[PDB]
Amino acid sequence: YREMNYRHSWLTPFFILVCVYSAYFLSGNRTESNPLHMFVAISYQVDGTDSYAKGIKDLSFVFFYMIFFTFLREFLMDVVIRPFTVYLNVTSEHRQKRMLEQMYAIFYCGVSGPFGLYIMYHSDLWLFKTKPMYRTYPVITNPFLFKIFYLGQAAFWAQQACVLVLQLEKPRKDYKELVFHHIVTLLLIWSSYVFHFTKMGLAIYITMDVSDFFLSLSKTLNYLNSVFTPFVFGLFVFFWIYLRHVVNIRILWSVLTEFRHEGNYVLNFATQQYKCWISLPIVFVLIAALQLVNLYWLFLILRILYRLI
């Protein structure tokens, strides 16, 4: 019993997840009155339309899906990702360990990436349109799939930050900057969701997801010692520039100008409208720190490109 739990660390999260889900489905209620709905699914809904509000039960959804994502990551890595790496015949233990995380990130960013593209397509934010994120501010009520995306991503990033907090592996070289990146993920997601800046963070979710997907594909192919790595790395660097820099600079420029001139700009605490002259510096700082981190990583990628050319 405990011997399996010592190595198969996903057994306890699997048990918790399966017991919670089985109890929720066996109860037969499947409504907001069911207090397992507070954890299993998104609770606050505005009447019958696909508009979902915010509240305390959104934190418990994050808490439960943190365990969900711990289970998913550990399960995939031990039974699916690791035998797949073994089938690739990797002769280095460290390279295999790195490939484990790289393929997990590939899966997460190839699932949530297209997820972000799909939810954006069903909105007015297609092709990272600058106007929509400030037209309807404050976005008090979130759409169904939109809120699911935000809540699941928040739970996943909180889970990753917690795992990083329980330092078990040796601190890698970018641990000084990756801890800052995790901190800024949690801060940005929690501030954008709580302070009704939820439409605007999708355009930053999507660039993140796509760039990370191609970044993890590049590391996976290099660790695999594949021959098709230069083409994939070129696609990665092109899309990295376009998304994390061109689109991010467009978003920052909208924060500079389109934050004021477009949409309601007068501060109103009564209506929970925070889009004013005070939130503009806060938002610009919170996104300019991100742009500085992305610029430092662009410098690293440029150094790599110069070395390999």
Binding site: L59, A158, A161, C162, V165, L166, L186, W190, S191, V194, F195, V266, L267, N268, F269, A270, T271, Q272
Partner: protein, 131 residues
């Protein structure tokens, strides 16, 4: 594992603090948006109202007026006698960005017991409350 508990506690404290900040700002928006004005007439009677931006609607003016009336004056020391007059000519939200503003939506005259005769004539036909 104590680092995990500390990080989770700090994150939950930050979330709760920001939620309480939002709740208090929504509840007490008249403090941030409406600036009370006390224009004394004679004795303890003051012509009291508030001014601010568009966020200082009639609700904000009324809340600021009530807060000032029940705070600056102590009924236990002496029973109050005030009134609140509504400006029907303006919409519930009328204050512009410009510093000129306009006629306030809510105007209150609040005085003590010995000044009740002054506030009664100042309120004219408006209902006079006791506190």
């Amino acid at each position: 594992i104590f680092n995990l508990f500390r990080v989770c506690f700090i994150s939950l404290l930050l979330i709760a603090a920001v939620e309480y900040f939002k709740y208090g700002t929504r509840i007490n928006y008249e403090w941030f948006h409406c600036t009370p004005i006390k224009e004394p007439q004679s004795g303890s009677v003051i012509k009291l109202w508030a001014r601010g931006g568009p966020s200082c609607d009639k609700r904000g003016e009324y809340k600021t007026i009530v807060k000032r009336i029940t705070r600056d004056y102590e009924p236990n020391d002496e029973h109050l006698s005030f009134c609140i007059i509504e400006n029907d000519n303006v919409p519930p939200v009328h204050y512009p960005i410009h510093e000129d503003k306009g006629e306030p939506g809510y105007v209150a005259y609040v005085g003590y017991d010995t000044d009740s005769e002054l506030v009664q004539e100042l309120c004219a036909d408006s209902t006079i409350y006791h506190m």
